[PDB]
Design a protein around this ligand. Structure first.
Ligand SMILES: *CC(=O)N1CCN(S(=O)(=O)c2ccccc2C#N)CC1
Ligand SMILES: *CC(=O)N1CCN(S(=O)(=O)c2ccccc2C#N)CC1
Lengths: 304, 304
C-alpha cells in the first residue's frame, strides 16, 4: 500500500552520463555505443545564444575541440555531426555500460524519469510529464543541459528527452534524442512563451483509481456522467478533452476497482466544481496529473 | 530553476540488491562486502507472524535454508546471525559492486531515498521522510520488505532504513541497518497504531525558502514573529516546535534570500491561519515538509 511519485531506477542511465566541454561551455552528454549525444548549444558563447547560426558556428569546431570525459578518463572524439538540435560525437570506445536502449518521441501526458546531472555526474532523479504545451516542469540549474529523460521496460531504456532550455517563466524545453524539440521551442535566447498548461485528465483519473486502491475513497460519489457532459466541465477547468481512447486505457483500473470510468469522471467533475474542501487525496491537496494509467498499474502491481 | 521531489541516483544501491528466500517467503536483501542484510521475518510463515519467537524459529534454519540470488547467480551462505530485527547472512563472495558505505540511524524529519525492490530487482526510487511518529509514507507491496532507504554524500552511501512492515493504516515501519526499529514498532502482526503525524516545521520553512529562490513569492508578508509566538501557532496546527537549532540550520537559506528566518516563520504562520486560498507554492496546494534545509541547499546548488 501507499502510492508515491516514483522514478525508474537510474543506474542504467548513470552508466551513460559524460561531461562535454567546447571552449568554456560544460554540459552533459549521453554515451551509448561509440556516440556521445549532447545539446548543440555546447558550441555557443552566451553571446552566440541571442541569434546563433549553428552550421556556421560548427565550421570553426574540430573533433579535438570537443572534450569528452567519462569519470576522470578522456574519450577520443573521431567524428562529429549535427542532427537537428543535438550533436553526435563519435568516440573511439563503445560505452562498456551501454544498456539495451531505444530513442522514442513521447506524446504530451506521457511521464518519464529525469536524471539531473552536472559535469557528467548524477545529482538526482525525479518523475516528469510532457505537459500538453510541450514543456516539462523540471529542476535544472546551469550545467544540467544534456541531462536525459527515460522510461525502462524491464532491461531496455527508452530515452525520450534531453534538456536544452529554461523559458523566462522557469519551465523547461528540450528535444528527443534525434534532436527535435518538443513543441515550438528553439535553442535561442529569445521571447518564447508556453501555451496553456492544461491538466492531463486521463492521468488524474488514473491517480483517482490509485487512491481508491490505496483506501482514499472519500471523493467517490453517487453520480455518473457522459464523455460529452464531462468534457464541457473539462474545457471550463482547462482539463484536456477525454476521448474513448483514454476510457479504453483506464479499462484495467476500472476492472480492478469495479468503478466504471464514467462514474470516476463524475467524481472528478464534483471535485472540480466543489474543490477538496481542505481534504487530501494520496497526500495531495490538488489533483495529480503526472501518473499515466500505465504508471498506476506498474506501481500497484510491482513491475521490475 | 524549478524544484522537484528528488531522490538520490540509485545505481550504487541497485548494485547491492539480492533476493532472499527462506521456505516460501521471498523478500529483498542488501549485499555489502560478504554480508547480506534482510528482515528476520523472512523465516516466518504468515501464521508465525501473529506471535513469532524469532530465536526459536531461527534454531530450525541452517545456512543452506537461506537461498540468496544476485541476478540469476546463487550465493553460498557460510554463516547466519540475528542482530535485533535483521538477519546477517555471511556469503563466500564479497559483493564486487560494494560502494563506500555507512550505517546511520536518522532522526525524525530527516529525508532519504527508497529503492523499492521485488525479488531483489529494483522497480523504482522515491524520496521519503522519517515522520515525527517514526513511520514513513512509502509505496511497498508484498515482496518489497528489505528494500532500503539511503542518502549519498558524493561516493559514500549512508543506509538508514530497511523496510519491514505496513501498519493497518497503510503507513510503513522499518529498521536501521543494525535491525533496530524506528519508533515503538515490532515485527509482529498485532495492533500497532502510529501517534500524531505532525508536520516537520523546519522542512516546511526550507521549502518556503526554495519557493522564494524559484520565484514563488506571493505568500511573503509584512510580518515577523518570535520563536515562542510561532510555536503557539505550531502547537495549534500539529507542527513540530521550532528550536534555535532549526533557526541556525536555516541560516544559509536566510543569507541567500535576505529573508530573516523569523520573518519566514511569520509567513508560515499566516499560511496556517489563512490557508492557501486556492493558490499553490512550487506546484503544491499544501505545505511540503519532506525537504530538509540540506536538501534545499543541495538541489538549489547542484551537488553531485
Ligand atoms: C542547461 C545548461 O547547462 N545550460 C543552458 C543555459 N546556459 S547559458 O544560457 O548560460 C549559456 C552560456 C554560454 C553559452 C551557451 C549558453 C546556452 N544556452 C548554460 C548551459
Ligand atoms: C514487505 C514484505 O515483503 N512482506 C511483509 C508482509 N508479508 S506477510 O505478512 O504476507 C508474510 C507472509 C508469510 C510470512 C511472513 C510474512 C510477514 N511479515 C509478506 C512479506
Amino acid at each position: 500500500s501507499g502510492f508515491r511519485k516514483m522514478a525508474f531506477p537510474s543506474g542504467k542511465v548513470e552508466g551513460c552520463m559524460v561531461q562535454v566541454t567546447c571552449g568554456t561551455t560544460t554540459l552533459n552528454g549521453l554515451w551509448l555505443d561509440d556516440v556521445v549525444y549532447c545539446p548543440r548549444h555546447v558550441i555557443c558563447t552566451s553571446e552566440d545564444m541571442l541569434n546563433p547560426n549553428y552550421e556556421d558556428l560548427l565550421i570553426r569546431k574540430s573533433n579535438h575541440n570537443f572534450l569528452v570525459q567519462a569519470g576522470n578518463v578522456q574519450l577520443r572524439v573521431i567524428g562529429h555531426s549535427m542532427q537537428n538540435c543535438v550533436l553526435k560525437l563519435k568516440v573511439d570506445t563503445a560505452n562498456p555500460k551501454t544498456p539495451k536502449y531505444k530513442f522514442v518521441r513521447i506524446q504530451p501526458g506521457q511521464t518519464f524519469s529525469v536524471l539531473a546531472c552536472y559535469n557528467g555526474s548524477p545529482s538526482g532523479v525525479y518523475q516528469c510529464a510532457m505537459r500538453p504545451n510541450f514543456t516539462i516542469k523540471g529542476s535544472f540549474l546551469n550545467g544540467s543541459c544534456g541531462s536525459v529523460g527515460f522510461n525502462i521496460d524491464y532491461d531496455c531504456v527508452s530515452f525520450c528527452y534531453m534538456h536544452h532550455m529554461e523559458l523566462p517563466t522557469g519551465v523547461h524545453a528540450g528535444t528527443d534524442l534525434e534532436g527535435n524539440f518538443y513543441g515550438p521551442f528553439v535553442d535561442r535566447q529569445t521571447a518564447q512563451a508556453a501555451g496553456t498548461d492544461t491538466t492531463i485528465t486521463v492521468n488524474v483519473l488514473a491517480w483517482l483509481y490509485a487512491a481508491v486502491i490505496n483506501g482514499d475513497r472519500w471523493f467517490l460519489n453517487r453520480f455518473t456522467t457522459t464523455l460529452n457532459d464531462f468534457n464541457l466541465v473539462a474545457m471550463k477547468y482547462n482539463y484536456e478533452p477525454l476521448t474513448q481512447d483514454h476510457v479504453d486505457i483506464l479499462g484495467p483500473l476500472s476492472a480492478q476497482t469495479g468503478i466504471a470510468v464514467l462514474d470516476m469522471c463524475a467524481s472528478l467533475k464534483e471535485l472540480l466544481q466543489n474543490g477538496m474542501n481542505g481534504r487530501t487525496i494520496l497526500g495531495s491537496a490538488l489533483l495529480e496529473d503526472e501518473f499515466t494509467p500505465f504508471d498506476v498499474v506498474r506501481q500497484c502491481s510491482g513491475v521490475t
